Design a binder for this molecule. Structure first.
Ligand SMILES: CC(=O)N[C@@H]1[C@@H](O)[C@H](O)[C@@H](CO)O[C@H]1O
Ligand SMILES: *[C@@H]1O[C@H](CO)[C@@H](O)[C@H](O)[C@H]1NC(C)=O
Ligand SMILES: *[C@@H]1O[C@H](CO)[C@@H](O)[C@H](O)[C@H]1NC(C)=O
Ligand SMILES: *[C@@H]1O[C@H](CO)[C@@H](O)[C@H](O)[C@H]1NC(C)=O
Lengths: 352, 352, 352, 352
């Protein structure tokens, strides 16, 4: 708790005791290493799960998906060692990571033998097997969405003084729609508080009342935001959560904005996204009762690239509500083009 | 907002951005300028308060006593320019700081006079007067409680922690029974959370769904704890708040103890009270079905120096709750002497 | 070795792994507390030296004087336990320290028995004897300079998790004239190189040239600066070293300035000498080739404190050169008063 | 600079002023920008070099090769925008990185076109040209090493080096084979001295003499170690410098070990080479005078991977020297296999 505290705004070097949080979403690339636990038990789990008619796993976040491409060789070799013919295939995730009903069973006992964890686990290869245990990817045709597992892992301990934090995880014996709290946090001082998650960072201020300031989205989950680590969980609803609750929208006075509602058809397809309260270049948003009602988020740019400099709506706190996507700006549901037809603009992917 | 941390149980160090809280209950605040609005307006408060039957004040906290005392002499000189004859007397604060049905009014007009109230170069005095506005102490007869005010102040600024360190203030224009949220510090992470203010420190560990861990009291206020800043506002009663809400007992699951109720008869008199869950020296608390019922906290130390060692109770949980006061050790209401008469021991006067 | 970092010039906070120097010049007062290892062997060495004709020891560093003063009692008691007729008297510290031809011999064997000294180092009782194994002091008549032992010691271990990190020395097995490398640390980074040790602190930077900026001289030694721990020791002249080599002047480009010759006649009688390049208060220096020639340095004021305000220099580059001592503001030799008799100028004592 | 320090063998901790070194070899540093002065000045320099007849550039180090990989596209776009037709093509660094005799001429005047590409990070295309100003890569035939430049840049300033982490370079006016000192750190404390730069990490231990302890290499350059930035620069011979000076072998007694000689023919082709004084896995080294004389470094294993169990040496001192790279474990010149056919010994190709 002994800290370098140096007030950047006022240049105040100080130290003492308290609690400390750090912005790791941008520093995530060079801070984190992940892995499963007991790969033999995981081989037992995948084998047993295969006995339950399980296709694969549709990862909800990039953290888990990046895990499942780490012990694929070791998992396949362990399956080979005990004679289990099972090949795991891992593809690419696509936002918004949808909700899979199945859940990975938990073995009651490990495989009868196997000690490949000693020495060499990485540089291992084995021939494919007819059976495929797919992970993410565009294998929607190979198997439907109802045979895929989802949110069947946990974080018990992470962080190490080895320059590269190694994270311990294991298959859930429980069923949950809630996002993992081991890697979430917020706290408040005076006028400022912020909701922080590995794939979601949210800025909350107190200008007049407690409101929202900004949010960044690297990944597009489908779990639920908690209330225990949420501030002011008393007197708040889901519709005003600009972040959809189904998309893990916090239930706080700090997750609400005036003149705007939950955005379910937003650019939940974009791999990367940010919610900035700024008019996108060359686009001025108006507020007029004459304007149209809400509609699916339309990108600021037409397919031809021409920009639309006139956007309107009825009951918005002007001017901006635009998603900072890689492909451009997506505007909120209330904001709709004033003159450009709503069918001409790049409509957001169906992600309600 | 950029500082570091050095964990105790682990030597790992790392840092960047973050939010930070500090503890200032051990240091009993610190030397602060204590500008109440304007000293001329503060003096003009008492002319009309005194006129409408306010013969004294019951200070809510020790800060307030410091504040009135620190300007007591100057208050006598501000009113020398106009035909006002008052003399302010500030006495030691008796605990627990009972309430005052009156409040300090808010003058609407200023007295035309020199503005030398603040920053005077000394060399000035005032004329004493028979009528006395008694501020706490032993002026119960000189001023009835019904004519005393209380909790009639509101904090505005408490910054300038580098050089000026002024606790700027204003008479709260609003009759508030709750405490002031500004100087409160709190946050929760992992298995830990802790509230903090100018007179109290609170700890909360995720022992089993959170509970009461340890707190210290340097002053027994009689305000109330706001919910929008306390964890789990919903889901706790005021009776199981081991701190009576009357004493600003927080309304949170984190503020409660198994087998212990609100300690209304606790030693809220001892100017300082440290709340620790531990057997006091030389006492063995028992859990017997045949023990006695609740009662006012009996100090573990007798007036003659003898100490009653073996105590019992019917609904306790280890470790026992004993108020570590300068007066000695005081146990909870639930824990009574096994067989030594409660009359002989130093009973805690009913502190409701 | 990891650690914090704060560069106040840019406020750049850093943490990694490497080496960490410290500025301990101000901490010479109470940096260390210790005695030489096996004071019995040092007593044997002192007896052998005295038998060999070592009337005294000329302390080379104030650290050595501190150690000798601290260990005087234990050494005396060791001498008088074995029956040795020797009293070790440790005098004051006079600047500049002057060399001692002789050295402390390493004793072939320790004294037959000196266990009573074990655990009896500071609070040590003994008597006096006719023979005085003086240690520096104002005893030039008694033990002349040529008959004093000097720089015949070494350092084994220093630095610890304590304010007074115990230092263990050793009777130098052989001759030596250089200074101690173990307590030296240095390096260069961009535009700043600093030469620092237990008693000195020298600065340098590249202002279109690597020149001298400021040097703090708590003491005045005569050993030689080692090359193994020096920067840019290639192509530098003694006469341009503002600090002469005879007073332990580093041999580096960073230890010289332009338009100024070596200062061999400066206030080298000053106990504490700090060197800065800034105009002396209450005076001014002109670049006048008609000024005085080279010679002893002068104090800015007269004996009575009269401020000699008129000064000049043959070819100095403004700002001028002056010595800051406890005595007062002393000028460089190249600067002379435009109009002041040499009788009114205090000449810096010069010792060879 | 205010930092801290925590010991590893011990647990001593402390914070204070000083200077701090940081090892970025294993820590893998951070991302860097590598801005080459004014992009148009670089374009003019390369155009003038091509007019002179410079066919390409030899990236001395991996940092400069990454700089050219980051600067290629925008330089080509700038060239095509101006009346210039020359394409820059980069590739992979080949070890050992070879020298070049040419330097990029400093342009007299900037190319006549608009300035819009300060630190332009790609994302602009250009028309290919038959003429190519190849950079490193494998275009040896297209641009012979004769007309390949080498060390044509110098680091100027490291502005915003904590987060922005940008290294700004400019075309050197004068020729210089020397490496870059600004990115070199070193000092000595007690019995350890360490030499390192942006690419190299050398550990020297004092074991009865200042001796090397370990040497790790992530690249293979050909510049030269500056003397001002190393220790014990006297009484050192190249033959005992295990690292050849041609490999920027530091000139210090710390760079030599007894019983061995310079290794100018070792596995310097390795992209990563870690030198450890230890027997190669599955191999035994002995000291036999009848052993083969010094010869090219041989991988401990064979081409098929067979391990040589018996090894001999004429003058080696245990533990034996071995180069630990991804290719495998090697042996020095003095260490020859005791009895093994020379065909199966993977010689290190001569690095001339
Ligand atoms: C006697 C003891 O160790 N008690 C603790 C309990 O207070 C805590 O809540 C629990 C959490 O699992 O761990 C145990
Ligand atoms: C923000 O500052 C204060 C606090 O809410 C208020 O006066 C103001 O209206 C707020 N909004 C703006 C746009 O300044
Ligand atoms: C160096 O110092 C001189 C005068 O001492 C000053 O004019 C100049 O600006 C300084 N800086 C540089 C980079 O020369
Ligand atoms: C290393 O340790 C010390 C000197 O540094 C000494 O005892 C020992 O002999 C040295 N040599 C070896 C091989 O450890």
């Amino acid at each position: 708790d002994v800290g370098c505290s140096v007030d950047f705004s006022k240049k105040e070097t100080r130290c003492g005791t308290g609690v400390f949080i750090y912005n790791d979403v941008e520093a995530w690339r060079d801070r984190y290493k992940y892995h499963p636990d007991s790969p033999r038990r995981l081989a037992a789990a995948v084998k047993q799960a295969w006995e339950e008619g399980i296709c694969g796993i549709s990862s909800v976040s990039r953290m888990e998906n990046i895990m499942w491409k780490s012990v694929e060789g070791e998992l396949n070799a362990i399956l080979e060692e005990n004679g289990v013919q099972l090949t795991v295939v891992v593809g690419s995730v696509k936002n918004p990571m949808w909700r899979g009903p199945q859940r990975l069973p938990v073995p009651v006992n490990e495989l009868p033998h196997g000690w490949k964890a000693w020495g060499k686990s990485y540089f291992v290869r084995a021939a494919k097997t007819n059976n495929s245990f797919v992970v993410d990817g565009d294998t929607l045709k190979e198997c439907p969405l109802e045979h895929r597992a989802w949110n069947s892992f946990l974080v018990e301990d992470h962080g190490f003084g080895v320059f590269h934090t190694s994270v311990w995880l294991k298959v859930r014996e429980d069923y949950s729609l809630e996002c993992d709290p081991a890697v979430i946090g917020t706290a408040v001082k005076g006028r400022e508080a912020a909701h922080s998650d590995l794939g979601y960072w949210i800025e909350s201020e107190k200008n007049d009342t407690w409101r929202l300031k900004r949010a960044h989205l690297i990944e597009m989950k489908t779990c639920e935001w908690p209330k225990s680590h949420t501030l002011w969980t008393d007197g708040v609803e889901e519709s005003d959560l600009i972040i959809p609750k189904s998309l893990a929208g916090p239930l706080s006075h700090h997750n609400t904005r005036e003149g705007y509602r939950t955005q379910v058809k937003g650019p939940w397809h974009s791999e990367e996204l940010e919610i900035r309260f700024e008019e996108c270049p060359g686009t001025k948003v108006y507020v007029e009762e004459t304007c149209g009602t809400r509609g699916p988020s339309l990108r600021s740019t037409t397919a031809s690239g021409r920009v639309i400099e006139e956007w309107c709506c009825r009951e918005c706190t002007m001017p901006p509500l635009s998603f900072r996507a890689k492909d451009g700006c997506w505007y909120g549901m209330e904001i709709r083009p004033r003159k450009e037809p709503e069918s001409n603009l790049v409509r957001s992917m169906v992600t309600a």
